[PDB]
Amino acid sequence: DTIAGKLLTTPSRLFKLLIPLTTINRKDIEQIAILIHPQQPLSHLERLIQSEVPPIEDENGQKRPPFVSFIALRFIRWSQSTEIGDFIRDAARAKEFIVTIEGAPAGLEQIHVAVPSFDERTYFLRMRLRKISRRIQGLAEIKHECDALAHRGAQRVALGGFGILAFWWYIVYKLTFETDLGWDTMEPVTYLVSLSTLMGGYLWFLYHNREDFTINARQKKLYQMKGIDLQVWESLIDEANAIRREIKNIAAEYDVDWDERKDEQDDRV
Amino acid sequence: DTIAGKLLTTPSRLFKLLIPLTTINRKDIEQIAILIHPQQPLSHLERLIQSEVPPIEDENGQKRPPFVSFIALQLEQRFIRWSQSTEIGDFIRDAARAKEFIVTIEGAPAGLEQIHVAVPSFDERTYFLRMRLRKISRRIQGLAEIKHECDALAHRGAQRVALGGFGILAFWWYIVYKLTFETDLGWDTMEPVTYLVSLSTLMGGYLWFLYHNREISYTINARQKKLYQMKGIDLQVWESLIDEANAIRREIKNIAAEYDVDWDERKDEQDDRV
Amino acid sequence: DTIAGKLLTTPSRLFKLLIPLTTINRKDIEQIAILIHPQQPLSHLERLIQSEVPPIEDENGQKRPPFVSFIALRFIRWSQSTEIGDFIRDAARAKEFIVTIEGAPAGLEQIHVAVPSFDERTYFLRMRLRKISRRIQGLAEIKHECDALAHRGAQRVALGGFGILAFWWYIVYKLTFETDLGWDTMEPVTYLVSLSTLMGGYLWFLYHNREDFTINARQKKLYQMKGIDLQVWESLIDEANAIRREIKNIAAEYDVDWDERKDEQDDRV
Amino acid sequence: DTIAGKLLTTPSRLFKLLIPLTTINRKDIEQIAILIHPQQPLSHLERLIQSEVPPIEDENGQKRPPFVSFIALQLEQQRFIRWSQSTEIGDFIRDAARAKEFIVTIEGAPAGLEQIHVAVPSFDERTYFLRMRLRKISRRIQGLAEIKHECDALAHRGAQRVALGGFGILAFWWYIVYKLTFETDLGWDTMEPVTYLVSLSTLMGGYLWFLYHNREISYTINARQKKLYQMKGIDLQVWESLIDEANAIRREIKNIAAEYDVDWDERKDEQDDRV
Ligand SMILES: [Ca+2]
């Protein structure tokens, strides 16, 4: 109400702070809103506050605009070049922020805003990450059961092929080792059957048209039906880690340790 | 009508809005058009609407045109006043998630003395962006289909020579069967000729292993690269429309990231048909 | 006498203009430089010219800013919401630009600046395109020579292998089809040579260690020595086309037709 | 010293500049430390240097702030033009940075000349503070690349061993076929069917190994090795993160390199990784 304000984080990149000022023609309180970018100087915010307050009087004679001064944590004054990411950082550990406007105050000479923190600041991020990680998880398990399906079909068909070729081993062994028809009467059977399986291993090239199509390529053909491609997939995982390095940055610099399973424990509950 | 306005989204970058207020002698109220770029400050906007209104006769001197002020909703998951030199676009986004904002003139002729203007929606912003995206996306899907048919031409050009090879190998199977089973001649003269033929087809199957001559890929072949280009349709326009098409989806997903509404292009797969 | 002025394009993205103004208390002629990004609105430039000029007393009350008006080409006033790139576009067809401050100090009230051309602007692009065209050209022809070099060694080794294997055709034709040793005395020469051929592959696979390494892979290993990789290469070509689409944009908007060989005709002369 | 200055490049985003000027809090002339962010307007610099100087006494009596300015070199491919009081500092730094020229005109106070030249940091100087971190991260990804080469050496140990055993078995088969063939204790026509039977058996075993391609988890990444150098060795998330943090800086150095008309070649800094 009186000498107290708050700073809030947008869903976009920016900030906004709310300070009780006195405008050109108002009463003594009006919670005016100011939109700031965080990597930005501090003289910009000094100018942007001093645009909207009545100026200081002579002074013999000066109509010059007031001078704000962002003392923080006892009263360590901060310079006019430290960026707002760092000032909200060290002030965010301090949980305090003081804008002491002069001339305008008439002796009050103070304003206190309450800096948001890491749970609150990230909670906003966590929602972004919590949603996109759930969207990773569902597509992950559907892709896995498609993998099990194509694997099963491939090994069953290959097992059948080993069955018939083992049968060919058995009848050549017993035909030429029983010695009823000779090996001289067995040579044509071997070579002519070898061209016959070049035939039966070559018709499949032209009608049903394999033109590799190995074990892996049947699966890669298969979840074109049962799922989504890999570019969206790696975009989800890579951008998820891009968010995780940033929450590690902010929660590292705010110095409260954090792992993101602690809201997976609130996904179902 | 009187207390409702709307700010639309033009096909260009810059907005427009129409608000009713009193003017010179012609009429009591007219919804008048104001043209706005999203990078102009908010003082420019107030001045713009301060200019097309007859002033107030203000005593203690002459300070006659009014002082207007903007008000929105600070969502608590009230009404605060937005400062006079924010940029317009950031205020548009914040109050856009609030779905309302309020202009207040100083004249207060109306008892209410408020103007609740309406806020442009996700369907409208992404309506114009979706019309651009679907137009260029169709415009490359046709060239994708022409790629499919020249690929079918290469398929035909393969199936000819493959059919000839099957016929020749059937000829070989029949000539080995006739010169083998009949017994006019014993297997012990067809065996040597089989090994010699196997050497000759290992040679002919060895000179083909040098024939992998050009492979110009990027997904691109080399046998057809003269065919679909120097007789058909380009690839420079293909990759250029790819490059111009990849940018817009990120903007639609950023604005979509603002509005907390999910963006699915497969829910717009249904709009390319009816 | 100093109603002139000019605007110049920086080698960077954002460009500047030069106008004769009077800042605080000076002599009436002074160039002042103002930096402009061409995505900013017109009203922003209106504000920056309002910053450095004395105010105008207008009879209760004194407007602290003046008002300027960016009329152009027969005069058409332009609204203060257009893009500066568009106003430089249509004014660039017009080859004129007029700023008109309402206040006139002493019979002078106008200002003409001279909008520059695609010649100067696109030689701040043509210097870049010419340099990247030279780099791409030299690296291209070195890679082609390297490319030519690999295939000579590949055809020599393949031609030798076909030489000895054709010798293996002739020796098995002539030893047993027409001569004293029969096929029964020839079969283990064929099969035992076939395992002996295999031994060669194993030796090759282990000492000199080919673990495909086909004809293309000798090239791709070869210009790792003689040239540079493909990612930098396609980055240079793709960025070159990114510059070419932009000079096609600007010359498409300024409407003077252009092909970029017309400075390759000055790259040697 | 006298009329010279320098605007330095801190490792952070800020600048600093040291300019000599008379102040009666000090004795005669002190080079003073002023810091600058590149998004501050030039009015803040003229107010900042305007604040740490004792004022000019008004000859009208009543108005005593100093009035300072900035003047650069308009290049025509001399001539001097003054810069407005609300440009950002960074854009002016880039323009005068290719110009290699900077003056300041403090009104009234300068006894003689009143032309404080200062000197900008050349492209190499600006780059140096990027190239240190670029060289560091390139060095440690080179080291992790070398450890990847070490587990590659493990992989071909296994391959060589498996293949050596196969060559020994093939030598065994060549000797047993020669001994049971040339000796004329068994003729060829009882060794021929055993050869065809063995050929069927190795086509079966090749049909076993053609099934074996279970996992190929690539991105350039193997499947036998992925558990090998991670669950006992050194990570891969950190590898891709140093890739991601490493790819950004090169574009900035090439943008600033575009601003200075100087060819950026990383192979001319290949020579700096050794001495
Ligand atoms: Ca035989």
Tokens of A121: 């600041």
Distance CA C227, CA D96 (A): 38
The secondary structure element, H or E, covering residue C47 is helix C42-51
Q: Is the dihedral of CA A16, A19, A21, A25 positive or negative?
A: positive
Q: Which residue has the tokens 């292993």?
A: B209
The kind and range of the H/E element at C234 are helix C230-254
Cα separation, D133 vs D250, whole angstroms? 11
CA A100, CA A113: separation in Å to the nearest integer?
11
Cβ-based neighbours of C242, under 8 Å, separated by 6 or more: B243
CA dihedral over D44, D48, D49, D53, signed as positive or negative: positive
CA pseudo-torsion sign C7, C10, C15, C16: negative
H or E stretch covering B5: strand B4-8
In SS3 terms, A173-227 reads as HHHHHHCCCCCCCCHHHHHHHHHHHHHHCCHHHCCCCCCCCCHHHHHHHHCCCCC
Strand partners, D82: C32, D71
Regarding whether B91 and B165 lie in a shared domain, the answer is no
Alpha-carbon distance of C268 to C261, in angstroms, equals 12
Which CB contacts under 8 angstroms, 24+ apart, belong to D268-271?
Answer: D269/D131, D269/D135
Q: Which two tokens stand for residue D69?
A: 């300015």
Contacting residues for D136 by C-beta, under 8 A, at least 6 apart: none
End-to-end CA distance of chain B: 35
Best residue in B81, B85, B93, B269 for a mutation probing chain A (most A CBs within 10 Å): B81
B240 — contact with chain C (CB < 8 Å)? yes
Minimal-distance CA residue of chain C relative to B214: C216
Tell me the pairing of strands D71-73 and D80-83. antiparallel
For B262, name the nearest residue in chain A, comparing CA atoms only.
A131
Question: A265 is written with which tokens?
Answer: 């424990």
- State the Cα–Cα distance between residues C140 and C132, nearest whole angstrom: 12
Total structural domains in chain C?
A: 2
Q: For residue B191, report the distance from its CA to the centre of ligand 1, in Å.
A: 6
- A182 and A138 co-located in one domain: yes
Same domain, C146 and C88: no
What DSSP letter does each residue of D202-229 carry, written as one string? HHHHHHHHTT-----------STTTTHH
Compare CB distances from C48 to D84, D163, D195 and report the shortest one's residue. Answer: D84
- What are the φ/ψ torsions at residue B82 (nearest 5 degrees)? -85, 140
Experimental method: cryo-EM
Per DSSP, what are the bridge partners of residue D31?
D20
Task: With respect to residue C1, please indicate whether it lies within any of the assigned structural domains.
Answer: no
| CB-based contact, A65 to chain D, within 8 Å | no
Question: Is the Cβ–Cβ distance between A50 and A99 less than 8 Å?
Answer: no
At D73, give phi and psi (nearest 5°).
Answer: -110, 105
D192 marked among binding-site residues: yes
CATH classification at residue D92 = 3.10.20
Contact B210 C173 (CB under 8 A): no
Residues 6+ apart with CB under 8 A from D47: none
Return the DSSP state at C44.
H
Phi, psi for residue C101 in degrees, rounded to 5: -70, 135
D130 and D116 in a common domain: no
First CA to last CA across chain C, in angstroms? 41
A112 and A139 inside one domain:
no
Q: Please report the DSSP string for A103-122 in residue order.
A: SSSTT----EEE---HHHHH
CA–CA distance, C130 with C264 (Å, rounded to integer): 8
Distance D194 CA to ligand 1 centre (A): 11
> Is the dihedral angle over the CA atoms D143, D148, D152, D154 positive or is it negative?
positive
For A181, the domain range is 120-266
Question: Could you tell me the two tokens for C170?
Answer: 């002739």
Is B80 in contact with B96 (CB distance < 8 Å)? Answer: no
Q: What is the resolution of this structure in A?
A: 5.0
Which of these, D102, D150, D141, D131, lies nearest to D240 by C-alpha position? D141
Phi, psi of A61 (to 5 degrees): -120, 130
Q: Which residues in chain D are contacts of A40 at CB distance < 8 A? A: 39
Question: Could you tell me if residue B24 is left (phi over 0), alpha (psi between -120 and 50 degrees) or otherwise beta?
Answer: beta
B37 vs B89: CA distance, rounded Å: 8
Which DSSP letter does residue C185 get? G
Q: Examine the domain organization and report whether A125 and A256 are in the same domain.
A: yes
Best CA proximity match to C126, nearest among C241, C15, C243: C243
Q: Are residues C112 and C144 in the same domain?
A: no
Break positions in chain C: residue before each gap, C to N over 2.5 angstroms:
73, 211
Based on C-alpha coordinates, what's the Rg of chain B? 37
Chain A residue with CA closest to B170: the answer is A199
Tally A–D CB contacts below 8 A. 63
Nearest to residue D156, comparing CAs of D234, D225, D209, D235? Answer: D225
Cβ within 8 Å of residue A28, ≥6 positions away: A22
Six-digit token string for D251: 């574009």
The answer to whether residue B177 neighbours chain A at the CB level (below 8 Å) is yes
| Cis before A61? omega within 30 | yes
| DSSP 3-state of A92 | helix
- Nearest Cβ partner of C158 from B13, B44, B210? B210
Contacts of B98 (CB under 8 A, 6+ apart): B72, B73, B75, B119
Sheet (strand D71-73) strand order: C6-8, C15-20, C31-36, D80-83, D71-73
Do residues D124 and D89 touch, judged by C-beta distance below 8 A? Answer: no
Task: Tell whether D219 is covered by a domain.
Answer: yes
Q: Would you call C51 and D173 a contact, using CB atoms and an 8 Å cutoff?
A: no
Collapsing DSSP to helix, strand or coil, D233 comes out as: coil
Question: Of D105, D120, D135, which residue is a domain's last?
Answer: D120
Alpha-carbon distance of A221 to A150, in angstroms, equals 9
Residue type, D163: A
Q: Which residue is closest to A192 within chain B, CA to CA?
A: B173
* Residues of chain B neighbouring A191 (CB-CB closer than 8 A): 176, 194
* C in contact with A (at least 3 C-beta pairs within 8 A): no
Quickly count: other Cβ atoms within 10 Å of residue B28's Cβ: 7
Distance (Å, whole) CA C102 – CA C110: 9
Task: Classify residue D1: in a domain, yes or no.
Answer: no
Contact C33 D72 (CB under 8 A): yes
The reply to whether residue C188 touches residue D170, judged by beta carbons under 8 angstroms, is no
Question: Residue C16 and residue D95: Cβ atoms within 8 Å?
Answer: yes
Nearest Cα neighbor of B125 from B93, B157, B153, B151 is B93
Burial class (CB in 10 A: 0-12, 13-18, 19+), A83: buried
Indicate the DSSP class of residue B20. E
Of D200, D212, D198, nearest to D170 by C-alpha is D198
- Gap between the Cα atoms of D48 and B93, Å rounded: 36
Residues D105 and D159 in one domain: no
- What is the distance between the alpha carbons of residues C55 and A78, in angstroms, rounded to a whole number? 35
Angstrom CA distances, D159 to A22, C197, D137, stand at 80, 21, 33
Q: State how far the Cα of D126 lies from the Cα of D128, in Å rounded to an integer.
A: 6
Amino acid in the structure at residue C162? F
> Cβ(B223)–Cβ(B101) under 8 Å?
no
Whole-angstrom distance, CA of residue A48 vs CA of residue A56: 16
Q: Residue ranges of the alpha helices (H) in B208-235? A: 227-230
For residues D66 and D196, membership in a common domain is answered with no
**CA proximity to B85, closest of B45, B137, B118:** B45
Spatial separation of the C-alpha atoms in residues C125 and C250, rounded to whole Å:
11
Please check whether residues D142 and D187 belong to one and the same domain. Answer: yes
Contact between C14 and C35 (Cβ < 8 Å): yes
Q: Are A33 and B81 in contact (CB < 8 Å)?
A: yes
* Same domain? D161 vs D109: no
Which of B120, B141, B164 marks a domain boundary? B120
Query: CA gyration radius for chain A?
Result: 37
Contacts of C214 in chain B (CB under 8 A): 209, 212
List the beta strands (DSSP E) in chain A.
4-9, 15-20, 31-36, 112-114
Q: In angstroms, what CA-CA distances link A70 with A15, A34, C151?
A: 17, 16, 72
Tokens of D87: 């440009």
Of D123, D156, D115, D162, nearest to D268 by C-alpha is D123
What are the CA-CA distances from residue C104 to residues B233, C3, C21, C53 (Å)?
Answer: 61, 12, 11, 11
Phi, psi of D249 (to 5 degrees): -70, -30
* Of the partner residues C16, C23, C206, the one whose CB lies closest to the CB of residue D160: C206
Of A18, A128, A195, the CB nearest to B80: A18
Given B120, B137, B161, which residue is the final one in a domain?
B120
What CA–CA distance (Å, rounded) separates C173 from B199?
11
Residue C269 lies in a domain: no
Q: Are residues A144 and A168 in the same domain?
A: yes
3-state secondary structure of D187: coil
| Angle at CA of residue D32, ends D29 and D37, nearest 5° | 155
Which residue among C83, C165, C176 places its CB closest to the CB of B192?
C176
Of the candidates C55, C61, C51, which has an alpha carbon nearest to the alpha carbon of residue C102? C55
Q: How does DSSP classify residue B271?
A: G
- Chain C residues whose beta carbon lies within 8 Å of the beta carbon of residue D196: none
